[PDB]
Ligand binder design. Structure first.
Ligand SMILES: [Mg+2]
Ligand SMILES: [Mg+2]
Length: 88
RNA sequence: GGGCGUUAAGUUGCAGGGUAUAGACCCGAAACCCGGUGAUCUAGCCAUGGGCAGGUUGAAGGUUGGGUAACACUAACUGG
């Protein structure tokens, strides 16, 4: 999965600090990063269905976090998806 | 005894009757063989040139939008 240096880095970018490791914004950024990396993986390994079910979980899971955030603080939500360049 | 012979003059011209070989009384095939002449018609090919008013249909491809985690997909447009 994501590297410990690349994980720690995002938590810095989207968290209240280094240890704000479970905030919604952070969780959704980390999922985003791993989804986009894996875009590369399945480009070459289309037949890796098992791994894909794991990717699909990261997606459905990010979707639930984004909805919760939207419900609880739409302003925090808009920033977060624009910043992550999502929704189109 | 029997067969063929012995006891009939022939031959050379000339005219004629027939026959033979020859086109052989005249005309007439379809064809077979040999050597030439023809692709200015037409068949196919080769080189080099020319021609197809006007009106339709609107493939692939491309752009944008929506869409998808990403592809799929989908609309309009463009394209010809
Ligand atoms: Mg492992
Ligand atoms: Mg005599």
């Amino acid at each position: 999965s994501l590297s410990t240096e690349a994980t720690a880095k995002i938590v810095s970018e989207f968290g209240r600090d280094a240890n704000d490791t479970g905030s919604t914004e952070v969780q959704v950024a980390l999922l985003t990063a791993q989804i986009n990396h894996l875009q590369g993986h399945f480009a070459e390994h289309k037949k890796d269905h098992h791994s894909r079910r794991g990717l699909l979980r990261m997606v459905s899971q990010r979707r639930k976090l984004l909805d919760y955030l939207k419900r609880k603080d739409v302003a925090r939500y808009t920033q977060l998806i624009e910043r992550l360049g999502l929704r189109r």
